[PDB]
Amino acid sequence: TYGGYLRLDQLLSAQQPLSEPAHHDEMLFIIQHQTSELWLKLLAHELRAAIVHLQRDEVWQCRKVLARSKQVLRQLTEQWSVLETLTPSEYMGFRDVLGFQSLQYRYIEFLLGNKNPQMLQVFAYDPAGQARLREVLEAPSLYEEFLRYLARFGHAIPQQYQARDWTAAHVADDTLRPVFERIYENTDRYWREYSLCEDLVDVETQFQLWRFRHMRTVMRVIGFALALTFFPELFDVRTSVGV
Amino acid sequence: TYGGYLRLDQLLSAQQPLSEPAHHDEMLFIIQHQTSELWLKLLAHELRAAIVHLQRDEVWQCRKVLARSKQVLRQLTEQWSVLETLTPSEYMGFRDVLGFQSLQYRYIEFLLGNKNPQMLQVFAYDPAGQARLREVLEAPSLYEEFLRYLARFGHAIPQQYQARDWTAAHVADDTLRPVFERIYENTDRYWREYSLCEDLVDVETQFQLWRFRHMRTVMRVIGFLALTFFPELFDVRTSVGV
Amino acid sequence: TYGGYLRLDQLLSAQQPLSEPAHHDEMLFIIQHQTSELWLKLLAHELRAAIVHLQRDEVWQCRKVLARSKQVLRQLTEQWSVLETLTPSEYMGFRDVLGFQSLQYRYIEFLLGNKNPQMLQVFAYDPAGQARLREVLEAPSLYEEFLRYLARFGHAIPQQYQARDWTAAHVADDTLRPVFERIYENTDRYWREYSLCEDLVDVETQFQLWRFRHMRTVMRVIGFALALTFFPELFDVRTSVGV
Amino acid sequence: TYGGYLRLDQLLSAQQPLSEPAHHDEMLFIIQHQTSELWLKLLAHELRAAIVHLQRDEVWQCRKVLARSKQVLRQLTEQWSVLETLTPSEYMGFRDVLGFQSLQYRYIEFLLGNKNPQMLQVFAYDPAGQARLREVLEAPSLYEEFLRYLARFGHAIPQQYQARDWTAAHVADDTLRPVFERIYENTDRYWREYSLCEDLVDVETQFQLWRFRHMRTVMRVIGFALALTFFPELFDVRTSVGV
Ligand SMILES: [Mg+2]
Ligand SMILES: [Mg+2]
Ligand SMILES: [Mg+2]
Ligand SMILES: [Mg+2]
Ligand SMILES: [Mg+2]
Ligand SMILES: [Mg+2]
Ligand SMILES: [Mg+2]
Ligand SMILES: [Mg+2]
């Protein structure tokens, strides 16, 4: 049965609004958070595949899970259009019963390299999950594996990337500029690398839009935009390409 | 708690892939349909509110929930953009599944008006869900509660819409044509009706688009649209030059 | 004739890339600015209708020119997805031939209330446009007409808004809080006002989204922001409504 | 200068309403079709390149231009969202225009292979334009230059694709079935062909949505076959690829 394979009775019975007279607009609020959380589960799943592909020098496949990841990210961004229909007037009606962090979101941020050892606490409330979270904190990021990939093929990548303490969020590296300069200037020769650099900018960019949208919705519903970056050098290089 | 208010342990434990050496793209298949089903649940919730508001002549309240419905419908449509990344080569790896309806989906169509009693039988199981169909099947459609709305305000609505066998899917009626003709050719006096009409044309189009996408996505994955909910609404376009 | 009514010969004859050996990616770059510029012309047109409607107290007409404005604004936003495909490497090719402000953009910004008397002189060259621009600079904004509208129907709008120097950009006014506070608190009595507030929030939000996309594309293309606001009190009210 | 590079004086003087009295909604009608027309111009420009790259066996390159091409087709589709705000009430106001086809639209159907000689004598007016149509009418389609790409790398391709009357619209070839069957059934070896296959299914699908959309907006504005298919066996193989 369609309902049986997708476990719809379980899925469709996870919505328990807790407002006194059952406010009409509470449902939107729940669903919206639930669809998002499910997409976060798909994202992590694909992204994990990409890291393995890179590790095994499998470009097209890894490129074939990053393409999907972008689509999913574009969805996490599109969904805000519906929550935008929630007005302050409607929110007053059930906001009361509320008082909010996502272990899946943090997982995704850890995966892209934005690591923060302090984040492990506040989550050891789920050891099994905190364990999955710790595993990522201790291993290279998507960006770092990309770099470990470049070194495996003749690109001047600083030795410290072969092995260091991965638990510290990567720091912008000047010595990386020329590596990315050479790639963009010779595209015929470095087409594989070139394609991957662009896929990564897409991923970090679609991701920024998602965070920005998120903040505008919070403004219009609850009222009173960071500048963090995942791939510094890929963005910095823009100012020097074409020496 | 975040995870407690949303029931995340239950939600995120509803993904049961079943491949014997387990397949990678299977997960996409699942969560694709589950988020879709989740929006359908939110869509019905709003659509019902639209009917109640319509019965009370609460025009602005009604027009609104429809606005949200339009937005939800747009999401159901835009959403196929990720399933389209599933290739026949990938699908082979787990195609050994079934061959696939959707009670929730059917509920919305009944609600809009495409009534079909023969459907109640494809869900011989879980009579609670089957009971939901029957209950909405006997009530007037979203479109029909609109015609009764118009009757309450002096428009030439045929008597039969006051009471009849709601089980039978609406049938296009030529006698409505002049009613919508007066509305579109005098938009200032009838702005409320005018706006609701356009709201309805939006909901059908968006829905139509969604069905079209669904079919095109099926074409590329598995390999080898005349229904119309509000006929008179689309028909009048042809003669609104009176 | 389809081609003659739209004046397509004139239209498809306005693309003159000046890259030395005709660089393949210049075309995207030009039409991109052009479609954007055509949408900006439609926007100003509708927005102008909106001002008139509000002055004449015609709510639903106002509303339904504002509904289209949102769509056009969403178009200016979506459009960036195509320019994002322009890579630094492709940009290098014709980068060196171009050496960039829109009079229609500033017109749109003036309309919404972000008035800046200094802009005038930067357009001393097409006195015709400068004059169009001055007309707007001197008249109340879309937002200001909205407030003047509320004053016409029993809302405690400060007397000063009946007449003053519209040359200065609107300044956040805290005496406006209780006015917008009361609206959101009895949706039933103020449904008209309630809807316009939300249409206005939509317009500023969609507009912010557009400015953000713009900036992210500049980053991925040229590399190395402003949190202005058009309707302050409509956004500030979020924090008090209901307490 | 900005307005000089883009030729805005010409671009923004290409809107000639014909209403007397001037009708508010005529503008939307015009800019809607002109912006659409500009994108088509960029769409052709990229497609022609995709062909040349395909001729040169330059896979990644033919492929990038196709990605941008997909983005442009998406814009053409998403774009009807603003014309849907045009209502029968408004349309009556200027309806008196004419009973209405795009030379460029046909140029692109031809490029994709849906060729038709009777479709020439209908642009009976600027020969130079119908000339652009013929030049492509007798040239292989994007799909056919693809089939020839496949022939060069050892794929069982019928001889006729080597040379024939290109003026005729492709006819679904059953002997192509086992060819695509092998590519899909062994993606690692044929990753490039596998990629190009999928890229084509995207272009056709996005185009299908664009056509469906157009028809739906026509339905809601004016009043009362879309069974064409550019790459048939590509869609047909889906039903037989079974290990
Ligand atoms: Mg299962
Ligand atoms: Mg529940
Ligand atoms: Mg819940
Ligand atoms: Mg399951
Ligand atoms: Mg496919
Ligand atoms: Mg003309
Ligand atoms: Mg030019
Ligand atoms: Mg400017």
CSV table of C-alpha atoms in Angstrom, one decimal, chain D residues 45 51 78 87 101 104 128 156 177 192 231 238:
chain,number,residue,atom,x,y,z
D,45,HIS,CA,22.7,32.4,-28.7
D,51,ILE,CA,25.7,22.7,-31.2
D,78,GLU,CA,8.1,31.3,-14.3
D,87,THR,CA,-8.2,39.8,-16.3
D,101,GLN,CA,3.2,34.5,-33.6
D,104,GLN,CA,12.2,33.6,-32.7
D,128,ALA,CA,16.1,38.2,-43.8
D,156,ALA,CA,25.5,1.6,-32.7
D,177,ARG,CA,16.6,1.7,-28.3
D,192,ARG,CA,29.4,11.6,-20.4
D,231,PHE,CA,13.8,13.5,-28.2
D,238,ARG,CA,12.7,4.4,-19.9
